[PDB]
Design an enzyme around this catalytic site. Structure first.
Site, PDB file in Angstrom:
ATOM      1  N   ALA A 103       0.902  -1.279  -0.047  1.00 22.26           N
ATOM      2  CA  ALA A 103       0.087  -0.278  -0.106  1.00 22.26           C
ATOM      3  C   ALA A 103       0.786   1.200   0.087  1.00 22.26           C
ATOM      4  O   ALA A 103       0.388   2.160  -0.377  1.00 22.26           O
ATOM      5  CB  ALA A 103      -0.927  -0.085   0.946  1.00 22.26           C
ATOM      6  N   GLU A 147       3.219   1.801  -1.853  1.00 15.79           N
ATOM      7  CA  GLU A 147       3.810   2.156  -2.983  1.00 15.79           C
ATOM      8  C   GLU A 147       2.438   2.525  -3.823  1.00 15.79           C
ATOM      9  O   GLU A 147       2.328   3.270  -5.102  1.00 15.79           O
ATOM     10  CB  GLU A 147       4.128   0.825  -3.964  1.00 15.79           C
ATOM     11  CG  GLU A 147       5.582   0.396  -3.601  1.00 15.79           C
ATOM     12  CD  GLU A 147       5.882   0.236  -1.860  1.00 15.79           C
ATOM     13  OE1 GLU A 147       5.393  -0.998  -1.517  1.00 15.79           O
ATOM     14  OE2 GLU A 147       6.926   0.903  -1.263  1.00 15.79           O
ATOM     15  N   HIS A 190       3.761  -0.322  12.333  1.00 15.54           N
ATOM     16  CA  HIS A 190       4.213  -0.191  11.052  1.00 15.54           C
ATOM     17  C   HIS A 190       2.641   0.134  10.362  1.00 15.54           C
ATOM     18  O   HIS A 190       2.592   0.951   9.595  1.00 15.54           O
ATOM     19  CB  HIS A 190       4.401  -1.595  10.527  1.00 15.54           C
ATOM     20  CG  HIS A 190       4.978  -1.598   9.156  1.00 15.54           C
ATOM     21  ND1 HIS A 190       5.963  -0.693   8.655  1.00 15.54           N
ATOM     22  CD2 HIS A 190       4.458  -2.453   8.158  1.00 15.54           C
ATOM     23  CE1 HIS A 190       6.148  -1.218   7.275  1.00 15.54           C
ATOM     24  NE2 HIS A 190       5.359  -2.197   7.034  1.00 15.54           N
ATOM     25  N   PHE A 235     -10.334   5.916  -3.004  1.00  8.76           N
ATOM     26  CA  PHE A 235      -9.573   5.381  -1.735  1.00  8.76           C
ATOM     27  C   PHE A 235     -10.214   4.057  -1.719  1.00  8.76           C
ATOM     28  O   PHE A 235     -11.051   3.811  -0.987  1.00  8.76           O
ATOM     29  CB  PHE A 235      -9.577   6.223  -0.593  1.00  8.76           C
ATOM     30  CG  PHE A 235      -8.897   5.817   0.632  1.00  8.76           C
ATOM     31  CD1 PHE A 235      -7.659   5.422   0.465  1.00  8.76           C
ATOM     32  CD2 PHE A 235      -9.431   5.423   1.836  1.00  8.76           C
ATOM     33  CE1 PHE A 235      -6.968   4.981   1.705  1.00  8.76           C
ATOM     34  CE2 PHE A 235      -8.581   5.302   2.923  1.00  8.76           C
ATOM     35  CZ  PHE A 235      -7.473   4.801   2.888  1.00  8.76           C
ATOM     36  N   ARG A 267     -14.900  -7.304   4.352  1.00  8.32           N
ATOM     37  CA  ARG A 267     -15.200  -6.232   3.452  1.00  8.32           C
ATOM     38  C   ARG A 267     -14.622  -6.384   2.154  1.00  8.32           C
ATOM     39  O   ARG A 267     -14.609  -5.653   1.212  1.00  8.32           O
ATOM     40  CB  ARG A 267     -14.241  -4.952   4.120  1.00  8.32           C
ATOM     41  CG  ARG A 267     -14.866  -4.423   5.332  1.00  8.32           C
ATOM     42  CD  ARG A 267     -13.839  -3.664   6.291  1.00  8.32           C
ATOM     43  NE  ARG A 267     -14.774  -3.466   7.555  1.00  8.32           N
ATOM     44  CZ  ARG A 267     -15.193  -4.134   8.597  1.00  8.32           C
ATOM     45  NH1 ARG A 267     -14.822  -5.635   8.369  1.00  8.32           N
ATOM     46  NH2 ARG A 267     -15.633  -3.546   9.470  1.00  8.32           N
TER      47      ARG A 267
HETATM   48  O1  LIG Z   1     -18.744  10.506   4.132  1.00  5.95           O
HETATM   49  C1  LIG Z   1     -18.426   9.430   4.623  1.00  5.95           C
HETATM   50  N1  LIG Z   1     -17.865   8.523   3.720  1.00  5.95           N
HETATM   51  C2  LIG Z   1     -17.189   7.295   3.952  1.00  5.95           C
HETATM   52  N2  LIG Z   1     -16.633   6.653   3.138  1.00  5.95           N
HETATM   53  C3  LIG Z   1     -15.270   6.884   3.030  1.00  5.95           C
HETATM   54  C4  LIG Z   1     -14.936   7.844   1.570  1.00  5.95           C
HETATM   55  O2  LIG Z   1     -15.633   8.845   2.104  1.00  5.95           O
HETATM   56  C5  LIG Z   1     -15.161   7.263  -0.001  1.00  5.95           C
HETATM   57  O3  LIG Z   1     -16.404   7.035   0.005  1.00  5.95           O
HETATM   58  C6  LIG Z   1     -14.534   5.780  -0.551  1.00  5.95           C
HETATM   59  O4  LIG Z   1     -13.474   5.740   0.600  1.00  5.95           O
HETATM   60  C7  LIG Z   1     -13.383   5.767  -1.622  1.00  5.95           C
HETATM   61  O5  LIG Z   1     -12.784   7.154  -2.007  1.00  5.95           O
HETATM   62  C8  LIG Z   1     -17.518   6.817   5.291  1.00  5.95           C
HETATM   63  N3  LIG Z   1     -17.169   5.551   5.863  1.00  5.95           N
HETATM   64  O6  LIG Z   1     -16.499   4.741   4.929  1.00  5.95           O
HETATM   65  O7  LIG Z   1     -17.691   5.247   7.147  1.00  5.95           O
HETATM   66  C9  LIG Z   1     -18.483   7.504   6.360  1.00  5.95           C
HETATM   67  O8  LIG Z   1     -18.604   7.377   7.534  1.00  5.95           O
HETATM   68  N4  LIG Z   1     -18.607   9.043   5.891  1.00  5.95           N
HETATM   69  O1  LIG Z   2      -0.668  -3.026   1.591  1.00  2.69           O
HETATM   70  C1  LIG Z   2      -0.005  -3.303   2.405  1.00  2.69           C
HETATM   71  N1  LIG Z   2       1.571  -3.139   2.661  1.00  2.69           N
HETATM   72  C2  LIG Z   2       2.082  -3.430   3.489  1.00  2.69           C
HETATM   73  N2  LIG Z   2       3.555  -3.236   3.510  1.00  2.69           N
HETATM   74  C3  LIG Z   2       3.948  -1.800   3.921  1.00  2.69           C
HETATM   75  C4  LIG Z   2       4.458  -0.900   2.342  1.00  2.69           C
HETATM   76  O2  LIG Z   2       3.064  -1.051   1.738  1.00  2.69           O
HETATM   77  C5  LIG Z   2       5.483  -1.717   1.452  1.00  2.69           C
HETATM   78  O3  LIG Z   2       5.196  -2.863   0.929  1.00  2.69           O
HETATM   79  C6  LIG Z   2       7.045  -1.617   1.944  1.00  2.69           C
HETATM   80  O4  LIG Z   2       6.968  -1.157   3.036  1.00  2.69           O
HETATM   81  C7  LIG Z   2       8.381  -0.562   1.426  1.00  2.69           C
HETATM   82  O5  LIG Z   2       7.719   0.357   0.838  1.00  2.69           O
HETATM   83  C8  LIG Z   2       1.712  -3.906   4.606  1.00  2.69           C
HETATM   84  N3  LIG Z   2       2.070  -4.392   5.726  1.00  2.69           N
HETATM   85  O6  LIG Z   2       3.396  -4.277   5.962  1.00  2.69           O
HETATM   86  O7  LIG Z   2       1.388  -5.106   6.760  1.00  2.69           O
HETATM   87  C9  LIG Z   2       0.050  -4.368   4.527  1.00  2.69           C
HETATM   88  O8  LIG Z   2      -0.649  -4.906   5.625  1.00  2.69           O
HETATM   89  N4  LIG Z   2      -0.568  -3.803   3.597  1.00  2.69           N
END
Ligand SMILES: O=c1[nH]c(NC[C@H](O)[C@H](O)[C@H](O)CO)c([N+](=O)[O-])c(=O)[nH]1
Ligand SMILES: O=c1[nH]c(NC[C@H](O)[C@H](O)[C@H](O)CO)c([N+](=O)[O-])c(=O)[nH]1
Ligand SMILES: O=c1[nH]c(NC[C@H](O)[C@H](O)[C@H](O)CO)c([N+](=O)[O-])c(=O)[nH]1
Ligand SMILES: O=c1[nH]c(NC[C@H](O)[C@H](O)[C@H](O)CO)c([N+](=O)[O-])c(=O)[nH]1
Ligand SMILES: O=c1[nH]c(NC[C@H](O)[C@H](O)[C@H](O)CO)c([N+](=O)[O-])c(=O)[nH]1
Lengths: 154, 154, 154, 154, 154
Positions: free
Chosen positions: E56, E58, E88, E113, E127
């Site tokens: 993530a 990256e 981390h 996102f 999820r």
């Molecule tokens: O406006 C909100 N957006 C939420 N979604 C997060 C984000 O706003 C986007 O919908 C999606 O993450 C991709 O951008 C929420 N939750 O997830 O709980 C929330 O409570 N309220």
């Molecule tokens: O997308 C994820 N990246 C993870 N690695 C961290 C980072 O995204 C990179 O792979 C690395 O850190 C060098 O950039 C995670 N953990 O380490 O647990 C994880 O749970 N999820």
């Protein structure tokens, strides 16, 4: 759909590494892990530059400068921040991760986040070549992947 | 691999220091610690400029301006934020660390993070020349290292 | 070493103040505290401009605009965020402190952080002219210091 | 001292509103609250543009673009993020507040933070037209104030 | 008031997706969910480019670069960070969310996102196509909405 990946062939890649002296008991094993990983993936030992900085707070500064020379395909940041009695840990970790991220951003060069942030020494050893593997090795591999994937982008 | 370091020879270096008046009971010992450390490493007392600001929130502002004069090889930030009854501590520490980091970033000049952030007075004294050493001394040494390492970058 | 300070002589200084209406029961006492402090330090009442905004989230917006007019030597931000039942407190405080800091950064004009962030009304009254003094007075003094110290920088 | 305020006369103002669809059970009541508040303060219903986005994470994106059209005197952001089982809540709230703040910053147009962040549905209903009032109404009023105050700045 | 929306018609849209390999057990189901969702909404499978990155951290890097090619109407980021024994998790999640947000900001292209951040594997599965639906599907839909809504802005 159309897939865009990055293979693990390190041949021909030029890698830059920034390691923190702080907690070197750990970071040094991270460094050696990354080196071996890179070599066994085809990277030439001479194509690897390692820069040492005091602590993780400094890592971003060096990582950005190295990346800016545009001399590298990817940059690996290696550090170990172990929590103490104060919130110092928090700022060091945040600024490090914050800067390491913006370095790659503003530079266009992939900058791998290899800073081990633990609660204690045990969790550090755990991730520097023990139970959880070696974060340095994982970073080396990610560096290679990101470098190759980065060819697909301009 | 090819190693890039920074030795601890302070001779010829020009250092700038920003200290917070807040909690000067501690910060002053941090300052004197840094001074002595710098001198004993070869830095000339006259090549050291010290700027005092109210609190740690101000440190970034002064650190950036001093660094911008390009008159210094490295800048040492010295402060002490001790937690209180509110979350004030949080903002002061975050903004300080945030700014001290971006100062070095945007300025290209190494800016050493020497802000002691503790839960109580004891942990502060602990890190200002007692059990845990003197963070000021540690920062002086880091300043020197970063200055020297910085020569290797442009 | 060479010392760079800022004295507390407010004579001739032009000060801008941004106060949040939210929790004015407290902030107003912060404002009057700052005013008196400034006057008793030599600042002319007419050289003081005060701008009111809804809440602390707005403070950064006004502070930056006032600072940009380059009409002021320093800017004092006055606010009071008291924690509630939700994490709202967190965002308001963070963004406020974040913005107040970047305002000074991007503007070059000192912007004093005088936002009282407490867990309850008592701690607020505590810091608005009671047990802990008046944060407004402390900010006025810091504003003056930073203004004077700022002369030493370009 | 010289006071700079913003009155609550909405007549002639052009307001932009960004509402999140997520938790619309609440946000819709926030929106209607803001609308009524604006109208009863003199704003013409046709001078109000409302843009809907999936969630609060999107709010900043739309708020900045609307503000950039320079077609509005102020922008009201309306959302409701209710905490769940994961830290997702944290990122959504932070990024939202972070972006809503920088939107006004980079745009020069006031962007009112009207995102309700609660621990549960009850606290949400509490702030959407019940015990704690209607955050939408409070934001409308703030929008008007900031718009008027903004005239005093360039 | 005047409403500005985004319908769910994906026909003609060009979508870019960035997926993290880390926790692919989950992310892959996220990806397939997004794909199906996009197709069933009218998006042509060939108009969908998927880029894989190590973790993530990256994701932001790749998301920004893909968005910069201006070849896409919206970009969907898919990841799964599951908390471990250290902090981390915190840095990876923060930097990811921080970067995914600024990517869209600096690029003008909507960047959805879709990073699942849980405490355990169960909440992740929850999820990724179970009790709580599939975050990938929800992101696909949001991507389409944001793309369409984005036409209304320049
Ligand atoms: O406006 C909100 N957006 C939420 N979604 C997060 C984000 O706003 C986007 O919908 C999606 O993450 C991709 O951008 C929420 N939750 O997830 O709980 C929330 O409570 N309220
Ligand atoms: O997308 C994820 N990246 C993870 N690695 C961290 C980072 O995204 C990179 O792979 C690395 O850190 C060098 O950039 C995670 N953990 O380490 O647990 C994880 O749970 N999820
Ligand atoms: O890399 C690290 N740097 C550390 N030092 C902080 C910082 O990286 C600098 O050395 C110094 O703060 C001045 O910049 C650490 N601790 O303090 O614990 C740590 O654990 N790891
Ligand atoms: O350097 C410090 N500044 C402090 N003041 C906050 C800030 O640095 C400024 O002095 C003032 O807030 C105006 O910006 C502190 N406390 O408030 O406790 C502290 O412990 N240390
Ligand atoms: O100055 C404050 N503003 C507050 N409002 C937040 C913000 O400043 C704006 O008024 C509004 O959020 C829209 O921008 C506060 N609370 O909500 O609790 C508070 O305690 N203090």
């Amino acid at each position: 759909m159309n897939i865009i990946q990055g293979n693990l062939v390190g041949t021909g890649l030029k890698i830059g590494i920034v390691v923190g002296r702080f907690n070197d008991f750990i970071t040094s094993k991270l460094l050696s892990g990354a080196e071996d990983a890179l070599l066994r993936h085809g990277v030439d030992t001479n194509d690897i530059d390692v820069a040492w900085v005091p602590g993780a707070f400094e890592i971003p500064f060096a990582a950005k400068k190295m990346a800016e020379t545009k001399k590298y395909d990817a940059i690996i940041t290696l550090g170990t921040v172990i929590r103490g009695a104060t919130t110092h840990y928090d700022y060091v970790c945040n600024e490090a991760a914050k800067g390491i991220a913006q370095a790659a951003n503003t530079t266009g060069v992939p900058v791998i986040f290899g800073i081990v942030t633990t609660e204690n020494i045990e969790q550090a050893i755990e991730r520097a070549g023990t139970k959880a593997g070696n974060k340095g090795v994982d970073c080396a591999v990610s560096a290679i992947e990101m470098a190759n994937l980065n060819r697909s982008f301009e």
